[PDB]
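Example record for the data management plan.
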Amino acid sequence: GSSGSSGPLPSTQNGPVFAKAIQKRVPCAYDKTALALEVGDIVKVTRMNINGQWEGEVNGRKGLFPFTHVKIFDPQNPDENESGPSSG
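Corresponding structural encoding:
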C-alpha cells in the first residue's frame, strides 16, 4: 500500500471559535504546551483538533486547553452593551 503525498486541506475560509475561560487553568511545572487561563479570559483558537485539545493563543501564550474548561458563547453580541462615543 505505497503511501505518498496527497495534498493539504482544501482552500476554505472559516471563522474562529471564541470561548471564555469559566475556570482557572494553569500549566503544570512540567507543562509548557499547556496554556494558562483565568476566569474571564477570551481564548482565540484557530486550529481545533477533533481529538479534543485545541490550539489557542492568549496573552502572548499559545497552548493546548481542555474544552471542558471553557464555554462556547457569542462574545460578538451588542446585547448588554451600550453604544456611544467615548462611553462605556
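Summary line stored alongside the record: The two ends are 63 Å apart (CA to CA).
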